[PDB]
Structures are given as structure tokens and as C-alpha cells.
Amino acid sequence: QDSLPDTKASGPAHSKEVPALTAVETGATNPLAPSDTVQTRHVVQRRSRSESTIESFFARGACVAIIEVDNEQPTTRAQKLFAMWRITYKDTVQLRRKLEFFTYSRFDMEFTFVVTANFTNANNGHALNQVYQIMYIPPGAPTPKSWDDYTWQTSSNPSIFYTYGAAPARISVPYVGLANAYSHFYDGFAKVPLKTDANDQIGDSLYSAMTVDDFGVLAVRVVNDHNPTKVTSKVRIYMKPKHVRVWCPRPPRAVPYYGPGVDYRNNLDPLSEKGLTTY
Amino acid sequence: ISEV
Amino acid sequence: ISEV
Amino acid sequence: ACGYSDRVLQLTLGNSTITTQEAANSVVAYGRWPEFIRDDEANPVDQPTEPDVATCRFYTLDTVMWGKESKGWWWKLPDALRDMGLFGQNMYYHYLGRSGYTVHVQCNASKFHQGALGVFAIPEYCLAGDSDKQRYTSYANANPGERGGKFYSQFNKDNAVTSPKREFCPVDYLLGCGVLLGNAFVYPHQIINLRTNNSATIVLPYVNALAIDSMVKHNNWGIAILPLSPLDFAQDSSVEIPITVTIAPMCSEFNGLRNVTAPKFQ
Amino acid sequence: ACGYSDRVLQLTLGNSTITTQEAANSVVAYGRWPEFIRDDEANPVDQPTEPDVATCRFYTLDTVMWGKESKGWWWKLPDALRDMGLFGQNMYYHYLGRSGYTVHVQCNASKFHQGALGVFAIPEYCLAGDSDKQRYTSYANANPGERGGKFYSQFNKDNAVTSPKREFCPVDYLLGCGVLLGNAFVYPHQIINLRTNNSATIVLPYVNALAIDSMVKHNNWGIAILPLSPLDFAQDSSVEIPITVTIAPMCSEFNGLRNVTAPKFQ
Amino acid sequence: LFCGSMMATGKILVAYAPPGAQPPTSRKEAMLGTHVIWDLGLQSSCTMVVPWISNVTYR
Amino acid sequence: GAQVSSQKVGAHENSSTINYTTINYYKDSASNAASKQDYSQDPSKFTEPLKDVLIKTAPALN
Amino acid sequence: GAQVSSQKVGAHENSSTINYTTINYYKDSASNAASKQDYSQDPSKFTEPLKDVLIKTAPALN
Ligand SMILES: CCOC(=O)c1ccc(OCCC2CCN(c3ccc(C)nn3)CC2)cc1
Ligand SMILES: *C(=O)CCCCCCCCCCCCC
Numbered sequence A: 001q002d003s004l005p006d007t008k009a010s011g012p013a014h015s016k017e018v019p020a021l022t023a024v025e026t027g028a029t030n031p032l033a034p035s036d037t038v039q040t041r042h043v044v045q046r047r048s049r050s051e052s053t054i055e056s057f058f059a060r061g062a063c064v065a066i067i068e069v070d071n072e073q074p075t076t077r078a079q080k081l082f083a084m085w086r087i088t089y090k091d092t093v094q095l096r097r098k099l100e101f102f103t104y105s106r107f108d109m110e111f112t113f114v115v116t117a118n119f120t121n122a123n124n125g126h127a128l129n130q131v132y133q134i135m136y137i138p139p140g141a142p143t144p145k146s147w148d149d150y151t152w153q154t155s156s157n158p159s160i161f162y163t164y165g166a167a168p169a170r171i172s173v174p175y176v177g178l179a180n181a182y183s184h185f186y187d188g189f190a191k192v193p194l195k196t197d198a199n200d201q202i203g204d205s206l207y208s209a210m211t212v213d214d215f216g217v218l219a220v221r222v223v224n225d226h227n228p229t230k231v232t233s234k235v236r237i238y239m240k241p242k243h244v245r246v247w248c249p250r251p252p253r254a255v256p257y258y259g260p261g262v263d264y265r266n267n268l269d270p271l272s273e274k275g276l277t278t279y
Numbered sequence B, C: 001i002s003e004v
Numbered sequence D, E: 001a002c003g004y005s006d007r008v009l010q011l012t013l014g015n016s017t018i019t020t021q022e023a024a025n026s027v028v029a030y031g032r033w034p035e036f037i038r039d040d041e042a043n044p045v046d047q048p049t050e051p052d053v054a055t056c057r058f059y060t061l062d063t064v065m066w067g068k069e070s071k072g073w074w075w076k077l078p079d080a081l082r083d084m085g086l087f088g089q090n091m092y093y094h095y096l097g098r099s100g101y102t103v104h105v106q107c108n109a110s111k112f113h114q115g116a117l118g119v120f121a122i123p124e125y126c127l128a129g130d131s132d133k134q135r136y137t138s139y140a141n142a143n144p145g146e147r148g149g150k151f152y153s154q155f156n157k158d159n160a161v162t163s164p165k166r167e168f169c170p171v172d173y174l175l176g177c178g179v180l181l182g183n184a185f186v187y188p189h190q191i192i193n194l195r196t197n198n199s200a201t202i203v204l205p206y207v208n209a210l211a212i213d214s215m216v217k218h219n220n221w222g223i224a225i226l227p228l229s230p231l232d233f234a235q236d237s238s239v240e241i242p243i244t245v246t247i248a249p250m251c252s253e254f255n256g257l258r259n260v261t262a263p264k265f266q
Numbered sequence F: 001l002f003c004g005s006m007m008a009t010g011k012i013l014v015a016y017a018p019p020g021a022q023p024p025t026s027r028k029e030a031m032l033g034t035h036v037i038w039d040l041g042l043q044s045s046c047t048m049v050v051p052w053i054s055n056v057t058y059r
Numbered sequence G, H: 001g002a003q004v005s006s007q008k009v010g011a012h013e014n015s016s017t018i019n020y021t022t023i024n025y026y027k028d029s030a031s032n033a034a035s036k037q038d039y040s041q042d043p044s045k046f047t048e049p050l051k052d053v054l055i056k057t058a059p060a061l062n
């Protein structure tokens, strides 16, 4: 049973108990109910808070990235034959705001990949079905310079081999934090400037940033050799936190995000105009 | 099995 | 079954 | 019995005692009293230093004056205390240090004065900056020590790309961090309403995602004091009363001793 | 059993470890291991500070060079350690402080070198002065800190009445104090005889007529190192080997905390 | 490991300073942190343990 | 190793406790679905962080 | 013929031993997945291949 407290039949009052009065200076919120300030009937409560549990609130796959990758003839200039994405929930705003209702979090992460593709050019013949390779490159491991170089051999890095048309790719990731909890906010620095330093750049750092590569990257490529005609593709990444726990509540972001930290720039006017005595 |  |  | 009260307190730590004849009970942040790192939550293996009464005592910071134009004040912890006697020494001679705190904020006036101070204790108080540049506020400007910082009424952007101030720009109604001030009450707080109380007493545990961390690289708590209701007196338009912040470390323990850290605050 | 020895020691205090493969057992001064002030011998009533591993560890002082002309070296305790990390800070921030110590003196050479160092630990080591003037040695000159002082072979009196040096004149065979050196063995001691041992280890209790006193006004122990037999090697007339003194505070406790003492060593 | 001749003697300070301060340039500064004073003799070699002292649970 | 539990029935068909079965296929617990049987707690640490928590009918400031 | 064992739970949901079930479908054991419940051993054969293994506090060479 998970229903909320029943309402009590409460009656008339003439006493020296004054629950309606309090003092919010103390830091506390008055634990009042209708039966303290008005006559109430007995209501048997069936309503429950089941959808607002920390798990139910986050239990939904959110889009956090769109990785664009092409399969075309390797020419001699800047191309997208392979792509890399620093894993994060911050490129998007929606999940970012929900997780940021809290300072600390601990959870397992589910990743679901929706791959879509299309023809770029009106017509150079067609393409046989493409297989995609998503490789996780943890910090330290060699990053690919070429779409078919040796790093894609993937002997120890986790890789997904997705086939176009198949049900969207899906995997789970454990709680991989270097600490007892993921910090959604870090009031600090990774380096400190010492008086004895040679230049003042040695000890300089980005405020609120911790590790440089934080969790690593996802590298994406079409394993297929190029067709005559080009195929452009998009790997959409959906993120869902499961087996979730959260600490220290924070106010929701009220102005538009300006980068990874708490920085604001514009649209600092969130509230509407409404008259004091207007309903 | 395990029945709760 | 076999439960360890 | 005898005649005891919610408004009359005595705080005694080490060789220091505070008395208040007009308090508003006291807040224990998140319901947790400060404590030492337990063996089953321990991580550095070296025997810690616990200076007890020589570091866990009441340090009074430089007084600030509240006046009709005052927009707000903010401090970071442990930063506010980096130069406070043997605490600061222990903090800079060791790589690792944890601490809880008792914050006691002081503001008295008269039955004829008026105004309400919002005293806020915030975990990980990340503030917004100067510029177009993201996460660019310098260590020196992020950490004012005892002097603390101030809030502003609007976002005046640091315009000079050539020689940037690399400072914070904390806008009051956005709590200096992109959210609205009215919701700061989800954080551990008290209100100094001048008709009700001279002071606020918030006790703080060590809050962090680690059992212990670098106190020199990282602030755990931020203290924000924003006037929810402006100072007013009789009809004298330039009224001015002192706000004094007194802080004490609690259950302080240190790990990883070596030579002293000398940061560049220049 | 296994193969243990009187000459092979390991001293471990805090984050510091000393190993010696050629020691001469170890002396515990007057048979008393260092200890804390007992409640029935207590006198200041305020709760003491006990910094444990952060102050009770091995501080190595600047090395001195022993050579054919070397007459002797001397240090005072706690003075030698006044600037040693968190110990010095605790010493200057409190009116009262007591401490025991482990003194470890280091001098190695070769089976072909020769000489004998007399390592002496003396309670209340009062030295003689410069002048015609009695008890005129200045605080600044009485206390060399880490640098220590030296002995001389004869009494050369500071002659200039107009601008007096106000220094000590410690004559070696008079132990710098009016008595004969051969009798200094009634004091806690060891001998570094180069054919026998690299080092000497004297453990020291707090000795005083009070349970605790001002460490800044008063030295409890003096360390005197006089060559009983001169350094000699092969036939090279200007031989020279290093003598390194490493000291650790023990059972350190402090009373009467207030603002830091800044002495004038100028 | 001292690979010198048996007639050679010496005493060496070897140290570890946990992060956050100036990297040691002098024995005086190195003294202050975790350390072993090695004395050369029949036991040819000396072990210094660098103890896990860290803020994060994994580096 | 099958796990069996009661569904919280909302709209009841014209036919009482109805159950559902769950089995974990993977060794790593991160691979598991969400159990969603989540217990709750008091607002208190947040709604009343007070050292002397007082009764709602007595004066807040005494 | 079902095999049942305890998962080592890392991040615990707000809901204790959780199990997983395994069944082999093939006769040839090579066809099987990896059990991954692997026991360990001493470094000793490598870190101390000595005929007279000595105690760390006693002189290495006596
Ligand atoms: C510090 C703020 O950021 C976070 O809190 C936060 C951000 C991202 C998080 O995701 C976990 C990190 C990685 C670890 C592994 N990973 C993988 C692993 C394998 C594959 C095929 N694909 N992705 C991708 C995600 C977890 C937490
Ligand atoms: C406990 O689970 C024993 C009962 C198992 C009943 C048969 C289950 C058939 C499916 C087995 C799943 C194996 C997954 C790796």
C-alpha cells in the first residue's frame, strides 16, 4: 500500500493552540493541513505519489546527441567518414535540467541508438545496406585519425556493430564515477596557481571543470566501403538513468543555459507581467 | 522462485 | 535447478 | 522548567563562547550533525591529523555594513577561513582536509528598524561569470577569502576582450547562478527578520561526493546573504547597520601531510 | 631468532621512517620514555591541543660539515625546531607547550676513516657569554634555531664596550659552561666512534621543574656535539665528513591558545 | 639498489609528497612529507612505500 | 530464479490480485531493468532542519 | 537444469540480494558463455620464488 494520509473529520475550535501562526525565520515550513485551519470531513485517501519517485521521474529515454556520419569516396579534404563525440548530457537542455534539480547523483546508464540514413545526391546508382561501428574510447586509449585505421581493431574497447534497418541498438553502463557520486556541480578547480610558478598559465584552469576528458568519447563509422553514390547518416543517442539515487536539491534553471557551467548571458527576464490585484 |  |  | 527558551542560546566551542538573547531556534543542515570519516567510508590510508580545540573554534570574519543600497554578500567554505589561525595552517600543509562548520550570522538593530536578511547555506555554490567566455573565472577571483564577494542587481558584462577581468557577475534574483532566488529556500537557511531576531545559526556537515577532498582546490559550502526585504529606519534615507559573520570549523580532519601550499592570490 | 640486532634499527614516527644498519643500541634519557601530562600533575585548566602525527615526526636540520679543525656544535630544544612545519606553528600560536623528542644524529665514513663524536643531551644547558657583563647574552643570540651554534677552543673575550656583540663564548673543554667536558657523561649520551657506528639515538622526555612552560621563553634540552677524538683519514690533511641531525617531537601538547607570537630574531 | 663496492657507505633520503604544493626542489622541503632515510650497508636495498593518499576513490 | 510480484491494478476487467514475473538474464546488475517498487521518506530533513523541532500547535518562537 | 546466482549489485535502486539465471542450450561446453566467477591466487610463485622464504621484518641476507 502506497496511498497518501487520510483526511480527518475535524470540528469547531476555541483554544490556546494557534497552528495558523508560525515563524518562518527559523528555517522551517509549517507542517499544516486543512484540519488545522478549517472544519474538515473524513476522506479515505486513495491517491499515491508513484509517478513522482526519483526513478519514475527519470525513467524515460532522452535525446542527448545527434552524430552525423557519412559514407562516401575518401577524397583528400575535410570529411565526415568517421565522427567522435565527447559523452555528455550537456549538449541538450531537457535531461540536463531534470538531473540538475539535484547536486549529486548515482545511477546506471542506458544508451539506445536510433540510426537513420539517406541519399545526398539525386542519382549515382544506389547503396547496399550499411553496418555502423560505434566504439567507446575511454580516456587514455588511442583516438582514430583515419576511418579505417588500427584503433578500430577494438581489441579491448567496447564496440557496437549496428545493422541498418534493425531494431535500435541498446546497451547498459554501470556507475562509472571516480567518486562515490557523480557531481552535477563542482564549486572548484582542477589546478591551483602557486606563488612559485614560472608563468601564470601553469596553474590555470577552467572554473567548475574537473577532469579534461571526463568520461571519454564515442567514435562512429560506417564499416562499409564507399558506394559510388554518397550516403549521409545520423546516429541519435538516447540516454536513460536507471537504478537512480539523488542528493542535495537545487532550484531549477530559470534562464537559458550558456555552456557547461552555470553561466548566463541573455534572456534573464523569466517572469511575465501580471498586476498585483489581478486574478 | 521468489514471491513478494 | 542449481542455486549457488 | 526554570525559564529556558528557543531564542536564548549559548554556543561553546574550544576557548570561544557566543551568547544570543534573540535567536530563531537553530538549523542543522539536512538533519545531519558534523562527523568524522568512518573506517568503512575511509579512503586515504595515512593516519589523519585531528587538531580539535586549536582549529575547531569561532573565527570572526571582517564586518560588512548593510545599508539601503546593499545588494548582497557571499563567502565560500573553506575559503573564508584560509587564513584563520591554526585552521589555515592545517589546510595548507595537507593535501586532504574535511570539515563541518557552525555558521553564526549577526545583525542587530532596534524595535523601530526594519528589514529581512536571507541567510543561505548552499552545497557546491557555483557562480556565473563576467564574459562571453564560459567557465573562465580565475582561481584568484573565485576565492575572495575572508573579504567575500558581493551580489549585483543586473548583468553588466565584462566587455574588454584584450585584458579580461576574469571575475564573477552574481545577479541577486538569479542567485548569481541561473536559477530564481525565491527557490533558494530548498537550501539550508534562516531568516534574520529584524522585528523577530538578531541572528541566524546554521550547523553544517561536510557535504561532498567524496569522503575527503582538496580544500585548496574546492569549496564545499557557499554562504549567501541577500536582503529579502530592504533595510529601513524612521525616515533617515541613509540608514546603516553592521552584519558580522562568525564561523567555526567542526570535526576537522587532515590527510596527506607535506610542505606548505603557497597559492597565488595576486 | 631469525637474525635481529642491536645495530640495526628502524624508527617510525608519523609519515617518517629512519633505518640504520650500524647503530650502538639506543639511549632513553634517565630511563624515562616521553609521556603526556597526567590529570594529577596538570596545571593550566584549558583543554589542550594534541596534533599527533602532524607535529610528532622527523624533521631534518641543515647539515654541518665535520673537518680536522672542527671544535664542536650545539643546538637548543625546542629552539632548533621553531620553524619546523606544523610544530613551529603550534609552538608560536600557544603560550604553553610541552614536548619529548627522539634525537637521531648521523655521521658515516669508511673502515679507513677515524674519529669519535661525543653526542650529549643536557637538561637546562646554560652557556657562558662574551663579556665582563654577567648574564648579558641576548635572546636573539641565545637562540640560533636550526643553524645552531659552535664551540671554541679558548675564551676570547668580546672587548668592545661601545657596541657589544651580546653573544655566547662556549669553550669546548669547559663544556661552554664552567665545568669540565670529561664529566659530561653524567648527562644522557652516546658516542659516534667511526670504527663502530654511523649514528646515535637518544630518546628524550620533557624535563622541567614545571609540568609545562613557555617554549618561546625557555629551552628544556640542549644538544652538544664535541669531537672527543679528531677526524682523521688516510694522510689527507683536509678530510671532511657531513654530520646530519634529525629530530622528532614526541607527546607534544599545547595550552593557552591565542594570536601568533612573532619574535624578533634581528 | 645500491650497486656500489662494499667499501662505499652513505645515507640517502627518499621521499613522497602528496599533491597540492610546490614540487620539492630542496631536501628541507622533501623532509616534510612521507619519507625513508636509507642507510647503505649489508642490506643492499631499501623500499619506500608510496601510501594511497587521494581525494578520489580511483585515480 | 524467477521473481514474482503483485501488479497494482488500476482499471479492472469484469472477471483480486494479479501478478507479474521477472527474470534477470545478465550477470552485471547494471543490465537489469528498473524494479520501480520505490519506498519513500519524510520531507523533514528539508522541511524542518531544526535542532529543537517544535509541535505545530505551540508558539514557533517562545 | 537452470543455474541461479547472485549478482554483485553496484548502483542500488531505491527499492538486498538480486539473482540471475543461466541455462546451457548446447552439449559442447565450448559453446557456453563465460561464467566470470573467477577465483584468485597468490603472487608468491612470481614475487617470492625462494627456497627459504623469509619474513619481511628479518634481515634479507643473514
Ligand atoms: C560530471 C557530469 O556528467 C555526468 O554525471 C554523467 C555524464 C555521462 C555519464 O555517462 C557515463 C559515461 C560513459 C561510460 C561508457 N559509455 C559507453 C560504453 C560503451 C558503449 C558502446 N557506449 N558507451 C558511455 C558513457 C554519466 C554521468
Ligand atoms: C530460476 O530462474 C529458475 C527457473 C528458470 C525457469 C526457466 C527460465 C527459462 C529462461 C532462462 C533464461 C536464461 C537467461 C540467460
Ligand SMILES: *C(=O)CCCCCCCCCCCCC
Residues within 6 Å of the ligand: C001, H001, H002, H023, H024, H025, H026
Ligand atoms: C533445467 O534446465 C530444467 C528446467 C527447464 C525450464 C524450461 C527451460 C525452457 C528452455 C529449454 C531450453 C532448451 C535448449 C536446448
